[PDB]
Amino acid sequence: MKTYVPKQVEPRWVLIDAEGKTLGRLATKIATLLRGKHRPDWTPNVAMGDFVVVVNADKIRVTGKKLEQKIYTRYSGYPGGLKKIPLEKMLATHPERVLEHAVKGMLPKGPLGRRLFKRLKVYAGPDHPHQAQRPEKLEV
Amino acid sequence: MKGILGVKVGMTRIFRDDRAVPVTVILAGPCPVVQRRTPEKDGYTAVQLGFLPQNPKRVNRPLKGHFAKAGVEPVRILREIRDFNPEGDTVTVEIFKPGERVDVTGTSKGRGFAGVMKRWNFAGGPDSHGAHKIHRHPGSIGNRKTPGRVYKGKKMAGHYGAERVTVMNLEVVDVIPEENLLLVKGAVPGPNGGLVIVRETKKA
Amino acid sequence: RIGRLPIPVPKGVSVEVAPGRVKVKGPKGELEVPVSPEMRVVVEEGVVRVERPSDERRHKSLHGLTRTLIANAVKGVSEGYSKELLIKGIGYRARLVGRALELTVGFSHPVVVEPPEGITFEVPEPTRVRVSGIDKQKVGQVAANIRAIRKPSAYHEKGIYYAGEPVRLKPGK
Amino acid sequence: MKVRASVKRICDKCKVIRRHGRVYVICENPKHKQRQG
Amino acid sequence: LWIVRINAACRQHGLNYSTFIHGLKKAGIEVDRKNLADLAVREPQVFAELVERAKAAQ
RNA sequence: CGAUGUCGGCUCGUCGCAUCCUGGGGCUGAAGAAGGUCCCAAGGGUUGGGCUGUUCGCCCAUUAAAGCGGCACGCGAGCUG
RNA sequence: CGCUGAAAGCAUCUAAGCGGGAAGCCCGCCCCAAGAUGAGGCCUCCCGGCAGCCGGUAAGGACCCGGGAAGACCA
Ligand SMILES: [Zn+2]
């Protein structure tokens, strides 16, 4: 009686309003849905988590002074290539990259993880090009 | 931002107010417009210029259709002036005028696989006092075990030149409309006949 | 003894509470007070007040500041605010030019000030200057910039002074 | 602005204020003006 | 894996893993993580009954 | 210790700031100018020469200044010895 | 360095706020750049025998020269 393995099924799109929700918490729930660890037929070695589309990602909120005390930093490989970025600046430039980053930090590394993040779809503002995909709304 | 294609015909000094101001001569016009980058259609605003004309038997079908979409003659080279909406159908030197500051861009004279001195002006080593076979080598390139590597962009050998280059804020010494010639103070990147592009300078 | 204090609301003053903001239209003009949602507004004819929902530091703080700010507002649209500055130093003076203000206190060129929205630059003299308008803070910000232009001197009474600004300069040579 | 770690009142007009989280000894006397650090 | 799948199926009925385990333990049932998981994937109604006795344990 | 080549110079840098100049500011026993001190600040610069193997230092003439340090007291499968 | 300002009747640059403020940081200037596998966007051109398969093929390209301020080769 081997443990059950599921059949490769059509992942179900899900819409999520990032507006008002806390950054870390909402990103967490995004990670949970994206891993598909909500499904009883879960399996680790297979990407069967649901595609996710989030709207109003710019509307994300953050407790405390993280707007300016949180510094998304990056690296070029060049000497002095440590590019620091305050959170606010990252908002005005690329709000979606914030959530995409804070969720990338919450997914398992390795190729399965990358395909998971590729199953992610952040969109600042309200809209998204996925009406044909039927992104179901799901409060979190 | 006005700008015209052109070709470097050579350098020369002229006498403007008892001053042998050296200049370069640039056959710029006549540049016909072939397509206009509109933001609703191309995400931004710019134009596309043809210079010089091309033998029709030397043009693939796709390019030919690209010209027939306009009313333009088949042209050898085609480029874009970013953020420039010429009203007329052919940009010429008329947009420019003497004294106007411009910025010119062209491919520098490609100096092949250039050594490290010629490419980065390193000092090399001495020519006597026992320097063994390192007269033009760059000496050390890094540190010992920490970090035990070589940083990105460490100045080494490679192709010096042969790249896009923009010398800026030059002066339009004179315009020659009937010839479509342009006399710009200072030197221009690229060999004689090398394609170049002139634009309004971004300075102030 | 300050958020405790009631804010008497004498007409002509329109007071209208929306969540987090009040709305007061007086004869001088109109404005809104950003308000602490934790704080409460006693919108009463003749006097409107503020109430701290607790007694924490944050609610006597926001209570007092809310009260002072509101009363400053109704004082604003009602009778506005004004501030005078005494340009001093020999030859240093000013004079209006259109809306903006000319002012010369000894540079390689005189200096002009643009009056933001309204900010009145009354020029009673070239020595003294007035700046008024609905707003209390904005007035003090504009005139603040003014005295920031050519501040008072340490060794001379040669420079911009606030109306009532004393001058305690140390001696010199 | 006397910067130091032992910011303290010097005169009675030496008045302490925790501005921007730091502790500043603001006083009418310019010399007593102190910043803790 | 068993705790994962079981935890998912249980959360689809309101309670979490620890609550369900505590219930069945209190409910005097000895079925293990493997068979619980296989029920939750195969017998949503039977596993549903297990959750029934689970919250029944409270 | 069946090898991690050791001072110095050269070449090439990169980095920290406990900042030498350049930027901003506070206080002054800050009249002005020039300063002192401290604060924020590492973008750029930080000369040439005589002596000495020297680093260091002194000196010479300057300079806005002629910074201090880490990088195996950087760098010998890069050089010299 | 400030305006407004309560806690704390006063004052307070701060705690709600708003502002000024440097060779500093971001942009701005030039250069590279869609392997940006998130591989982007626009224009133009092309159209069957046995998710494919094969076919000559379309557009087009390549090889082959003759060269080139392009170049080690390649490009
Ligand atoms: Zn004092």
UniProtKB/Swiss-Prot annotation, chain A:
The keyword Oxidoreductase does not apply. GO terms for cellular component: cytosolic large ribosomal subunit. Keywords: Ribonucleoprotein, Ribosomal protein. InterPro entries: Ribosomal_uL13, Ribosomal_uL13_bac-type, Ribosomal_uL13_CS, Ribosomal_uL13_sf. Part of the 50S ribosomal subunit. This protein is one of the early assembly proteins of the 50S ribosomal subunit, although it is not seen to bind rRNA by itself. It is important during the early stages of 50S assembly. NCBIfam families: rplM_bact. This is Large ribosomal subunit protein uL13. The lineage of its organism: Bacteria, Thermotogati, Deinococcota, Deinococci, Thermales.
Curated annotation (Swiss-Prot), chain B:
Keywords: Methylation, Ribonucleoprotein, Ribosomal protein, RNA-binding, rRNA-binding. SUPFAM superfamilies: Translation proteins. GO terms for biological process: translation. GO terms for cellular component: cytosolic large ribosomal subunit. One of its GO terms (molecular function) is structural constituent of ribosome. The mass differences between the observed and calculated masses are suggested to be due to methylation, which is known to occur in the E.coli and R.palustris orthologs. InterPro entries: Ribosomal_uL3, Ribosomal_uL3_bac/org-type, Ribosomal_uL3_CS, Transl_B-barrel_sf. It holds the Pfam family Ribosomal_L3. Part of the 50S ribosomal subunit. Forms a cluster with proteins L14 and L19. PANTHER family: 50S RIBOSOMAL PROTEIN L3 (PTHR11229), LARGE RIBOSOMAL SUBUNIT PROTEIN UL3C (PTHR11229:SF16). One of the primary rRNA binding proteins, it binds directly near the 3'-end of the 23S rRNA, where it nucleates assembly of the 50S subunit. HAMAP family: Ribosomal_uL3_B. NCBIfam families: L3_bact. Belongs to the universal ribosomal protein uL3 family. This is Large ribosomal subunit protein uL3.
UniProtKB/Swiss-Prot annotation, chain C:
Keywords: Ribonucleoprotein, Ribosomal protein, RNA-binding, rRNA-binding. It comes from Thermus thermophilus (strain ATCC 27634 / DSM 579 / HB8). GO terms for molecular function: rRNA binding; structural constituent of ribosome. GO terms for cellular component: cytosolic large ribosomal subunit. InterPro entries: Ribosomal_uL6-like (IPR000702), Ribosomal_uL6-like_a/b-dom_sf (IPR036789), Ribosomal_uL6_a/b-dom (IPR020040), Ribosomal_uL6_bac-type (IPR019906). This protein binds to the 23S rRNA, and is important in its secondary structure. It is located near the subunit interface in the base of the L7/L12 stalk, and near the tRNA binding site of the peptidyltransferase center. The keyword Ligase does not apply. This is Large ribosomal subunit protein uL6. Belongs to the universal ribosomal protein uL6 family. Part of the 50S ribosomal subunit. GO terms for biological process: cytoplasmic translation. HAMAP family: Ribosomal_uL6_B (MF_01365_B). The keyword Ribosomal protein applies. Pfam families: Ribosomal_L6. NCBIfam families: L6_bact.
Swiss-Prot record, chain E:
Belongs to the bacterial ribosomal protein bL20 family. Binds directly to 23S ribosomal RNA and is necessary for the in vitro assembly process of the 50S ribosomal subunit. It is not involved in the protein synthesizing functions of that subunit. This is Large ribosomal subunit protein bL20. The lineage of its organism: Bacteria, Thermotogati, Deinococcota, Deinococci, Thermales. The gene is rplT.
